[PDB]
Design an enzyme around this catalytic site. Structure first.
Site, PDB file in Angstrom:
ATOM      1  N   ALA A  74     -13.180 -46.589 -54.594  1.00  0.00           N
ATOM      2  CA  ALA A  74     -13.740 -47.898 -54.975  1.00  0.00           C
ATOM      3  C   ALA A  74     -13.690 -48.184 -56.466  1.00  0.00           C
ATOM      4  O   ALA A  74     -13.244 -49.261 -56.849  1.00  0.00           O
ATOM      5  CB  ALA A  74     -15.182 -47.982 -54.493  1.00  0.00           C
ATOM      6  N   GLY A 170       6.988 -27.926 -32.079  1.00  0.00           N
ATOM      7  CA  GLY A 170       7.802 -27.191 -31.122  1.00  0.00           C
ATOM      8  C   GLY A 170       7.038 -26.625 -29.943  1.00  0.00           C
ATOM      9  O   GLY A 170       7.511 -26.660 -28.798  1.00  0.00           O
ATOM     10  N   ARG A 402      14.824 -17.424 -37.330  1.00  0.00           N
ATOM     11  CA  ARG A 402      14.820 -18.406 -38.416  1.00  0.00           C
ATOM     12  C   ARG A 402      15.445 -17.864 -39.683  1.00  0.00           C
ATOM     13  O   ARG A 402      16.110 -18.599 -40.419  1.00  0.00           O
ATOM     14  CB  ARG A 402      13.388 -18.876 -38.694  1.00  0.00           C
ATOM     15  CG  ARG A 402      12.869 -19.784 -37.584  1.00  0.00           C
ATOM     16  CD  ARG A 402      11.455 -20.252 -37.924  1.00  0.00           C
ATOM     17  NE  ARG A 402      10.989 -21.178 -36.905  1.00  0.00           N
ATOM     18  CZ  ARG A 402      11.128 -22.492 -36.944  1.00  0.00           C
ATOM     19  NH1 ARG A 402      11.717 -23.121 -37.944  1.00  0.00           N
ATOM     20  NH2 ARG A 402      10.647 -23.183 -35.922  1.00  0.00           N
ATOM     21  N   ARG A 544       8.509 -14.684 -38.565  1.00  0.00           N
ATOM     22  CA  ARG A 544       7.702 -15.196 -37.468  1.00  0.00           C
ATOM     23  C   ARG A 544       8.575 -15.969 -36.477  1.00  0.00           C
ATOM     24  O   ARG A 544       9.416 -16.733 -36.965  1.00  0.00           O
ATOM     25  CB  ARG A 544       6.607 -16.150 -37.982  1.00  0.00           C
ATOM     26  CG  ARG A 544       5.819 -16.726 -36.814  1.00  0.00           C
ATOM     27  CD  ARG A 544       4.638 -17.540 -37.320  1.00  0.00           C
ATOM     28  NE  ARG A 544       5.025 -18.750 -38.046  1.00  0.00           N
ATOM     29  CZ  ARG A 544       5.479 -19.837 -37.423  1.00  0.00           C
ATOM     30  NH1 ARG A 544       5.598 -19.853 -36.104  1.00  0.00           N
ATOM     31  NH2 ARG A 544       5.814 -20.921 -38.109  1.00  0.00           N
TER      32      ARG A 544
END
Ligand SMILES: Cc1cc2nc3c(=O)[nH]c(=O)nc-3n(C[C@H](O)[C@H](O)[C@H](O)COP(=O)(O)OP(=O)(O)OC[C@H]3O[C@@H](n4cnc5c(N)ncnc54)[C@H](O)[C@@H]3O)c2cc1C
Ligand code: HEC
Ligand code: HEC
Ligand code: HEC
Ligand code: HEC
Ligand SMILES: O=C(O)/C=C/C(=O)O
Ligand code: NA
Length: 568
Positions: A74, A170, A402, A544
């Protein structure tokens, strides 16, 4: 006017937004936002007035009830939170450019003043457990502790809930679920264990992975009982069979699971405080926790008295300075993460005497959209897409792990590649329509045209897909040994997405045992202190598996709230 308040006061009193004494209600600005909504309507109602064809500041993928003050301050100019990942064409009144520069826990040492005053005062609250972070691990801990009879306060340093977990697209891994059986899939906790260990280069703590695999079905069960849809089961990289659970049709699992957790927390009347940053775990003279010092963005420092503190603060993948010191090959990469994912929770854990482990292991997501600068889920490959280089050729098994897929793409001409798919793949995963809406998936009725549009050899691309479709029908990829070939790319139009790796997940973090208790370097438990989710190290090892983080945060989050309540 130079700010929003000055605008309103031309025709309104101070008490049109404020309480009678004029003091701010709380760090969530609950009263104040309630006033904005009394005049302007709900976020939904406002959105009706700001529609664009492909986007809307007031109707986004964020779950929960996003407060107006998240973006509209504000008495000073403020920033559009969406500008931390996207660059949509917005004209917000009294805007300034997005800039995040949150002081580190160590820089906050300069508030010795204010902090000493706060610790010298009475605790603002006395409860059983305080949970830090409103992602999947934190909401899970808060709910499960509350269900075990504990009184909980949940704090979030950002203006919005969800952390990175609200972004997951995913799925959530589990075995062997009713959901899988309904889809005729055969799986087992042992196989999930085996895939996970092997995927992590056997660096993973086997006791922690055994918790991850053995509890996985119950966590899917727990979420479903709370109202979640986890009935779609897809394939992700490095998995022996389909085990990534997500909502019907292949919608994003993250936003959905966080919304379910938020609804269940509100149902239980859990005390959730936004704009509230956990700064320092407090311990008694015998070294057990006794509370936590926090800093409210609008009300300042205060402490909370409690028997247990659960750190659920997420990873540090947005902090490229800290990432690059641990893994220099990721220096300068773009991140998939929310602006707050910078690792200040780890600092809080270390200052409380927790040790860290596996910190050097940092994961890049192989396919960040080059055009959009946002993550494109691995599920696109899992559901059938292939990858091609500028030469128009395949170059990698697209559902390998990955680390190997990222290196493959980086090794191609221009350090990027292209996801290629058809309408059969598009219709199988509804999340893909979100990429098309973002404008990052150019399309055409033939690969020669697509290739000319995108600077891919069009003839080589055409022959590349014909050849790939032949391996699909013959059931074996003799070119890159891709072990799952779910669909031929041969229905309707063709799509391309330019992609390159982005920093995504930090596998290392605070050392925990199987009961989520945090430990020091002497491997001794710090009584009262718990860790769950990406803040922890040891679950995922050196790499991972896609789908295993959502699994981790529900299992370990739920475990931790139950252990903390029992500790009490
Ligand atoms: C785009 C994207 C897609 C992904 N998709 C998948 C998927 O499909 N499947 C999968 O398994 N994994 C996926 N991952 C990984 C998974 O989403 C994350 O590892 C997960 O978010 C970890 O959840 P968490 O609860 O540990 O942390 P988060 O969800 O990050 O939540 C932590 C919260 O703590 C808050 N916080 C931090 N420090 C403080 C502090 N000092 N005080 C108060 N609050 C604090 C943060 O602001 C944040 O809101 C994805 C990640 C991203 C970014
Ligand atoms: C609603 C549209 C507002 C009007 C009108 C006024 N204030 Fe306000 N104020 C409001 C909020 C959302 C907040 C949070 C900070 C922000 O800028 O968004 C504030 C805060 C203040 C404060 C700070 C309180 C503190 O730091 O403890 C004060 C001193 C304050 N506002 C004063 C104030 C006065 C006197 C007003 C009338 C002239 C006034 N505000 C109007 C939102 C709004
Ligand atoms: C009713 C008493 C109001 C309160 C409380 C707040 N707003 Fe408001 N605002 C109000 C009006 C009557 C107007 C003009 C347009 C109209 O509805 O007739 C506005 C305007 C704003 C704007 C636009 C500013 C500009 O320069 O054009 C915005 C962005 C807006 N208001 C935001 C906002 C927020 C976030 C509020 C709470 C902190 C809030 N308003 C309170 C009516 C009222
Ligand atoms: C960030 C995620 C925001 C939140 C949360 C809210 N608003 Fe917003 N608001 C934001 C932007 C980027 C813009 C511009 C829209 C565009 O397409 O360019 C707005 C605009 C306003 C206005 C102007 C609408 C008009 O009459 O033209 C209003 C009145 C408005 N915002 C109000 C408002 C309220 C009350 C909110 C809470 C319910 C709120 N916004 C949330 C960014 C964001
Ligand atoms: C980074 C952490 C994000 C923030 C902050 C916001 N968005 Fe987002 N957005 C994110 C991802 C990774 C994606 C890709 C597609 C997916 O669903 O995962 C998107 C996509 C969108 C889109 C396109 C699809 C759609 O939902 O219509 C839009 C229009 C979009 N995002 C809007 C949006 C707004 C308004 C935000 C602020 C409230 C916002 N996003 C923030 C990642 C990130
Ligand atoms: O959808 C993905 O790419 C993310 C999966 C994972 O990070 O687990
Ligand atoms: Na970690």
């Amino acid at each position: 006017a130079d700010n929003l308040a000055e605008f309103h006061v031309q025709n309104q009193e101070c008490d049109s937004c404020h309480t009678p004494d004029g003091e701010l209600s709380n760090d969530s600005l609950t009263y104040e936002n309630t006033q904005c909504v009394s005049c302007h309507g709900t976020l939904a109602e406002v959105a009706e007035t700001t529609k664009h064809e492909h986007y809307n500041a007031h109707a986004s993928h964020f779950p929960g009830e996003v407060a107006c003050t998240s973006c509209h301050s504000a008495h000073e100019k403020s920033m559009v939170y969406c500008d931390s990942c996207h660059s949509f064409d917005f004209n917000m009144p009294y805007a300034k450019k997005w800039l995040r520069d949150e002081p580190t826990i160590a820089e906050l040492a300069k508030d010795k003043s204010e902090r000493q005053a706060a610790l010298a005062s009475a605790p603002h609250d006395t409860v059983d457990v305080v949970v830090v972070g409103s992602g999947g691990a934190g909401f899970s801990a808060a709910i499960s502790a509350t269900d075990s009879g504990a009184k909980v306060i949940l704090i979030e340093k950002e203006p919005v809930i969800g952390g990175n977990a609200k972004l997951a697209a995913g799925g959530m891994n589990a075995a062997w679920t009713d959901q899988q059986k309904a889809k005729k899939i055969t799986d087992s906790p042992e196989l999930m264990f085996e895939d996970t260990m092997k995927g992590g280069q056997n660096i993973n703590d086997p006791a922690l992975v055994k918790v991850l695999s053995s509890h996985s079905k119950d966590s899917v069960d727990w979420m479903t009982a709370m109202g979640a849809d986890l009935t779609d089961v897809g394939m992700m990289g490095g998995a022996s069979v389909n085990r990534a659970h997500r909502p019907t049709g292949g919608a994003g699992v993250g936003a959905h699971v966080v919304q379910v957790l938020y609804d269940n927390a509100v149902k239980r009347n859990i005390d959730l405080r936004m704009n509230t940053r956990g700064i320092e775990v407090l311990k008694d003279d015998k070294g057990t926790v006794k509370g936590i010092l926090v800093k409210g963005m609008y009300k300042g420092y205060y402490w909370v008295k409690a028997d247990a503190v659960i750190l659920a603060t997420g990873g540090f993948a947005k902090n490229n300075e800290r990432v690059a010191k641990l893994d220099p090959s990721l220096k300068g990469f773009i991140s998939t993460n929310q602006p707050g994912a910078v690792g200040d929770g780890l600092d809080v854990a270390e200052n409380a005497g927790g040790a860290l482990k596996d910190m050097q292991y940092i994961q890049a997501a192989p396919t960040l959209s080059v055009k959009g600068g946002v993550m494109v889920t691995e599920a696109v490959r899992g559901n059938g897409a292939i990858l091609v280089n500028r030469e128009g050729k395949r170059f990698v098994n697209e559902i390998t792990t990955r680390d190997k897929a990222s290196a493959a793409i980086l090794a191609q001409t221009g350090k990027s590649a292209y996801l290629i798919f058809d309408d059969s793949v598009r219709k199988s995963l509804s999340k893909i329509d979100k990429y098309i809406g973002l404008g990052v998936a150019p399309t055409a009725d033939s690969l020669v045209k697509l290739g000319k549009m995108e600077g891919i050899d069009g003839k080589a691309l055409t022959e590349t897909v014909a050849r790939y479709n032949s391996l699909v029908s013959s059931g074996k990829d003799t070119d890159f040994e891709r072990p799952n070939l779910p669909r031929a790319l041969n229905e309707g139009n063709y799509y391309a997405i330019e992609v390159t790796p982005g920093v995504h997940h930090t596998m290392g973090g605070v050392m925990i045992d199987t009961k989520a208790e945090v430990m020091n370097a002497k491997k001794q438990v710090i009584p009262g202190l718990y860790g769950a989710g990406e803040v922890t190290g040891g679950v995922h090892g050196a790499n991972r598996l896609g789908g295993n983080a959502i699994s981790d945060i529900i299992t370990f989050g739920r475990l931790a709230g139950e252990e903390a309540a029992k500790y009490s």
